[PDB]
Amino acid sequence: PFKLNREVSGFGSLNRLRKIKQREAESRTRQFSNAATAPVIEVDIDSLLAKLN
RNA sequence: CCUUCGAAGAGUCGCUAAGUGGGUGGUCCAUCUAAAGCUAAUAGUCGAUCCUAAGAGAUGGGGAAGCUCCGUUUCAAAGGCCUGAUUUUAUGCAGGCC
Numbered sequence: 455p456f457k458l459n460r461e462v463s464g465f466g467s468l469n470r471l472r473k474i475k476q477r478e479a480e481s482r483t484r485q486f487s488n489a490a491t492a493p494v495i496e497v498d499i500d501s502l503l504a505k506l507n
Numbered sequence: 508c509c510u511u512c513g514a515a516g517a518g519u520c521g522c523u524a525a526g527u528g529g530g531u532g533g534u535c536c537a538u539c540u541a542a543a544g545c546u547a548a549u550a551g552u553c554g555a556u557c558c559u560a561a562g563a564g565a566u567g568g569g570g571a572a573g574c575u576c577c578g579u580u581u582c583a584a585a586g587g588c589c590u591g592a593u594u595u596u597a598u599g600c601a602g603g604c605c
Contacts, residue, residue, distance in 0.1 A: 464596045 458506040 462472045483497060 466596070
């Protein structure tokens, strides 16, 4: 398995607000319906890996 | 016009208060509302210049209505220097000496 890089790494004020903004966008990209018939969520891996590389 | 409400200056008045309270007058009555404020009518070479001596005298602080006085290192945050791969949640100075 590949060792990727986390999006925001730090706890200073700038990094803490980066974390806030990154979590705020996670409520809209990785949605899970908690249902048996939930679809498998597929996203744009190219952009994410651009963030994680 | 109708209806529902309706605060009031304390080390102050007089050691130290009150809220139909209080202040001042009159032989019970009369009159005002303090302790807040505004408002017109011939020298690098000789000396000084530099250094400190007895002493004087700022700052810190204190007294006095004040012009000013006391006190000279005093319960003052009274200033200089050095080191470092750039300082470990990521490039907002850390440590040391007198």
